[PDB]
């Protein structure tokens, strides 16, 4: 929409301080859609991406609105607000968490784009569901990280669309490198790839062998940072985290309803509204098994990332009081 582009491109962009986007405790709940788009421009601006990459304001504005438009409004959790919150957590980890200091402008550019694009056109159903219902997407990508390959395909489509080419000014070598980093960062959002690769990351930290100058270690770190940002709603102050967990559960139960109606199966506990009683004990298990070690490792990388670990520990204690 041309009208929405004009509304955004002609608007004054408030400061990062005013928008509170540097805060790990940030909440999008009170913001209007236009305000989330203004926050997004501010993220690109303050990470020196607009200046460094000579980005055309109108093009960046069109791209943000195209990304926002390509998230489904009938998806409870994996929608524009979650992608926006993931990017905000990336901005906070880069600024407040001091991750910016450890990466190049090209990596930062790729991470912010990947954070905003990582769930593009998420259908609100898991990879397993798409393989189960024999969906065309599952066939296109050989049942491996189906959604994640699709999110990158949607990301590229937007980047290649007329008037949305925010990378048009990059040199050919920079452009190819950025797309490769974006692709790897989006694929990293598949929790199966996080579990597969995390052991190597935790071992590198434990042995003090963690070296960001090594290209293989750099890619591994960017993958871990993507997961940390993706799951970051689990680290928010209790009331904010509780409201998002309700959306997470709503999406899982919506898939379960689809499985009951289309496949005639009793869904897995995670996807079964009738087994909503398992939520608190399952949240404790998931935080302990998946979340804590990741936030611990990121804090070892940069001490300033501690609020993510602190919030995760506080939420674990709260969910446990509900489950016990
Ligand atoms: C609330 C719904 C019930 O959650 C139960 C716990 N739980 C789970 O058991 N399994 C998940 N994924 C599939 C299995 O994965 C294995 C373990 C690798 C799973 C995925 N995401 C969340 C989540 C994320 C952010 C978030 O932010 C607030 N709140 C909850 C929780 C999750
Ligand atoms: Mg995803
Ligand atoms: Zn996500």
Under DSSP, is residue 293 helix (H, G, I), strand (E, B) or coil? helix
Among the listed residues 74, 76, 71, the one whose alpha carbon sits nearest the alpha carbon of residue 87? 71
CATH of the domain at 10: 1.10.1300.10
Which residues touch 3 (CB under 8 Å, ≥6 apart)? none
One-character DSSP codes across 34-96: HHHHHHHHHHHHHTTHHHHTT--HHHHHHHHHHHHHTS-TT-SSSSHHHHHHHHHHHHHHHTT
Q: What angle do CA 151, 156, 162 make, to 5 degrees?
A: 135
216 is in an annotated binding site: no
78 is catalytic: yes
Cα gap 110→44, rounded to integer Å: 11
Q: How many CB atoms lie within 10 A of CB 202?
A: 17
Among the listed residues 35, 156, 24, 31, the one whose alpha carbon sits nearest the alpha carbon of residue 90? 24
Q: Is the CB of 244 inside a 6 Å radius of any atom of ligand 1?
A: yes
> Structure tokens of 141?
């990508």
Tell the residue number behind the tokens 């990470």, with chain if given: 47
- Determination technique for this PDB entry? X-ray
Which atom in ligand 1 lies closest to the alpha carbon of residue 233?
27
Test site for ligand 1: of 194, 283, 315, 322, most ligand atoms within 8 A of the Cβ? 283
Which atom in ligand 1 lies closest to the alpha carbon of residue 245?
28
Domain span including residue 163: 1-324
Test site for ligand 1: of 196, 286, 318, most ligand atoms within 8 A of the Cβ? 286
Longest Cα pair distance anywhere in the chain, in angstroms?
A: 57
Per-residue burial over 61-86, b if 16 or more Cβ lie within 10 Å, else e, is bbbbbbbbebbeeebbbbbbbbbbbb
CA distances from 187 to 39, 41, 182, 203 (A): 25, 24, 9, 22
Contact 146, 137 (CB under 8 A): yes
Backbone torsions φ then ψ of 308, nearest 5 degrees: -65, -45
CA of residue 72 to ligand 1 center, whole Å: 20
Contact 316, 241 (CB under 8 A): no
Query: Counting beta carbons within 10 angstroms of the beta carbon of residue 130, is it exposed (0 to 12), middle (13 to 18) or buried (19 or more)?
Result: buried
Among the listed residues 34, 56, 33, the one whose alpha carbon sits nearest the alpha carbon of residue 44? 56
Among the listed residues 155, 36, 38, 46, the one whose alpha carbon sits nearest the alpha carbon of residue 92? 46
> Structure tokens of 323?
């489950």
Q: How many CB atoms lie within 10 A of CB 40?
A: 27
Which residues touch 152 (CB under 8 Å, ≥6 apart)? 117, 182, 183, 186, 187
Cα gap 176→186, rounded to integer Å: 16
Which atom in ligand 1 lies closest to the alpha carbon of residue 287?
6
Resolution of this model in Å is 1.9
CA of residue 283 to ligand 1 center, whole Å: 6
Helices (H), 118-232: 127-132, 136-140, 146-160, 172-187, 191-206, 215-230
Which atom in ligand 1 lies closest to the alpha carbon of residue 242?
28
Contact 94, 48 (CB under 8 A): no
DSSP letter at 103 equals: S
> Structure tokens of 60?
């960046």
Contact 94, 47 (CB under 8 A): yes
CA of residue 151 to ligand 2 center, whole Å: 8
Quick one: how far is CA 113 from the chain centroid? 10
Neighbours of ion ligand 3 (CB under 5 A): 119, 230
Q: Is the CB of 279 inside a 6 Å radius of any atom of ligand 1?
A: yes
Tell the residue number behind the tokens 């055309």, with chain if given: 56
Cα gap 212→215, rounded to integer Å: 7
Question: Which ligand does the CA of 80 lie closest to?
Answer: 3
> Structure tokens of 164?
């949305």
Domain count for the chain: 1
DSSP letter at 297 equals: H
Contact 225, 189 (CB under 8 A): no
Which residues touch 126 (CB under 8 Å, ≥6 apart)? 147, 255, 271
DSSP letter at 24 equals: T
Cα gap 137→127, rounded to integer Å: 10
Quick one: how far is CA 81 from the chain centroid? 10
Tell the residue number behind the tokens 């998002």, with chain if given: 244
Tell the residue number behind the tokens 């489904």, with chain if given: 72
Cα gap 308→105, rounded to integer Å: 24
Cα gap 36→80, rounded to integer Å: 9
> Structure tokens of 238?
């209790």
Tell the residue number behind the tokens 């446990």, with chain if given: 320
Q: Is the CB of 290 inside a 6 Å radius of any atom of ligand 1?
A: yes
Cα gap 128→134, rounded to integer Å: 10
DSSP letter at 125 equals: S
Q: Is the CB of 131 inside a 6 Å radius of any atom of ligand 1?
A: no
Q: What angle do CA 193, 194, 200 make, to 5 degrees?
A: 105
Among the listed residues 132, 128, 157, 161, the one whose alpha carbon sits nearest the alpha carbon of residue 145? 128
> Structure tokens of 290?
């998946």
Quick one: how far is CA 112 from the chain centroid? 9
Q: How many CB atoms lie within 10 A of CB 232?
A: 26
Cα gap 79→68, rounded to integer Å: 9
CA of residue 202 to ligand 1 center, whole Å: 21
Q: Is the CB of 283 inside a 6 Å radius of any atom of ligand 1?
A: yes
Contact 5, 61 (CB under 8 A): yes
């Amino acid at each position: 929409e041309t009208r929405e582009l004009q509304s955004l491109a002609a608007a004054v962009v408030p400061s990062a301080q005013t928008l509170k986007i540097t805060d790990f405790s940030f909440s999008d709940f009170e913001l209007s859609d236009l305000e989330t788009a203004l926050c997004t421009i501010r993220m690109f601006t303050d990470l020196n991406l607009v200046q460094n990459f000579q980005m055309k304001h109108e093009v960046l504005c069109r791209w943000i609105l195209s990304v926002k438009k390509n998230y489904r409004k009938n998806v409870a959790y994996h929608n524009w607000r979650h992608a926006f919150n993931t990017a905000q957590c990336m901005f906070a980890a880069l600024k407040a968490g001091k991750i910016q200091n450890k990466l190049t402008d090209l990596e930062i550019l790729a991470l912010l784009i990947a954070a905003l694009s990582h769930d593009l056109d998420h259908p609100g159903v898991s990879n397993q569901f798409l393989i189960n219902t024999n969906s065309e997407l599952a066939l296109m990508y050989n049942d491996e990280s189906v959604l994640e390959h699709h999110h990158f395909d949607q990301c590229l489509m937007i980047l290649n669309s007329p008037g949305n080419q925010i990378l048009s000014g990059l040199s050919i070598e920079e452009y190819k490198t950025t797309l490769k980093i974006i692709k790897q960062a989006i694929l990293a959002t598949d929790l199966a790839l996080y579990i597969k690769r995390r052991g190597e990351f935790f071992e590198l930290i434990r042995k003090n062998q963690f070296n960001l100058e090594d290209p293989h270690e750099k890619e591994l770190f960017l993958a871990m940072l993507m997961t940390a940002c993706d799951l970051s709603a689990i680290t928010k102050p209790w009331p904010i985290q509780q409201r998002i967990a309700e959306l997470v559960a709503t999406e899982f139960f919506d898939q379960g309803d689809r499985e009951r109606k289309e496949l005639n199966i009793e869904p897995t506990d995670l996807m079964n509204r009738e087994k909503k009683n398992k939520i608190p004990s399952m949240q404790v298990g998931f935080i302990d098994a998946i979340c804590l070690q990741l936030y611990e490792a990121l804090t070892h990388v940069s001490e300033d990332c501690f609020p993510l670990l602190d919030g995760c520990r506080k939420n674990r204690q709260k969910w446990q009081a509900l489950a016990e």
